């Protein structure tokens, strides 16, 4: 591949430059090349990988929603064709991320922080595929997302305190999955509420800076709860 001849450290450095320049496609390509060196990512590097692909797929999802809305209201072939083009590119990015996770990053060995991070990510990218899927294909994709989130949840509850920001963000996204994808708003609401309440009870153990990190995500859980109820 085009990054094969570049040093790992140079790929990381250029990913950071690409972020500063808001060149997220480049950022993702540099981070993919770094993953392909075969070494485990540090916490900082995991964040870089995630930010890069989040921004790439985020732009595609926003465009897909615009085009899908135009298409639904129109219902020549042009709107459908262009929506399909964007959809295929979005699916390609999701398949790229899922492939990196399965081929390189998800491991049975590993610290809880990385295992939960990557299983959550797998759930997220199956969720993005589910947003554009239909019929029975959608069913299988939904189950793949659920399974990844559930394994991440099980690890996070055993191996991380209830205020851990990664655990909290996983619960936030899994609850969004229940509400938006799986037609399970009651489960979404219950998960957000118990997660919020169990974090609030343990805030007293945290430093000022950890308190801010945890409460910022708790505030997102509350925002969704108050939206939904």
């Amino acid at each position: 591949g085009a990054m094969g001849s570049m040093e790992r450290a140079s790929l990381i450095q250029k990913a950071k430059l690409a972020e500063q320049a808001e060149r997220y496609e480049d950022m993702a390509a540099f981070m993919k090349g770094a993953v392909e060196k075969g070494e485990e990512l540090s916490c900082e590097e995991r964040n870089l990988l995630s930010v890069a692909y989040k921004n790439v797929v985020g732009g595609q999802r926003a465009a897909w929603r615009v085009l899908s809305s135009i298409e639904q209201k129109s219902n020549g072939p042009e709107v459908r064709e262009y929506r399909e083009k964007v959809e295929t590119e979005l699916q390609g990015v999701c398949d790229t991320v899922l492939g990196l996770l399965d081929s390189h990053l998800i491991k049975e060995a590993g610290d809880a922080e990385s295992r939960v991070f990557y299983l959550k990510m797998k759930g997220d990218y199956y969720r993005y595929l589910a947003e554009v899927a239909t019929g029975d294909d959608k069913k299988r994709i939904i189950d793949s997302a659920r399974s990844a989130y559930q394994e991440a949840m099980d690890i996070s509850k055993k191996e991380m305190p209830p205020t851990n920001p990664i655990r909290l963000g996983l619960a936030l996204n899994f609850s969004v999955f229940h509400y938006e994808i799986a037609n399970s708003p009651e489960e979404a609401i219950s998960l957000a509420k118990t997660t919020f309440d169990e974090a609030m009870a343990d805030l007293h153990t945290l430093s000022e800076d950890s308190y801010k990190d945890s409460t910022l995500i708790m505030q997102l859980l509350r925002d969704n709860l108050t939206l939904w109820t």
């Binding site: 964040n47 509400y179 997102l220």
Partner: peptide, 7 residues
């Protein structure tokens, strides 16, 4: 849709 983690 409901907002997910912004990062």
């Amino acid at each position: 849709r409901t907002p997910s983690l912004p990062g």
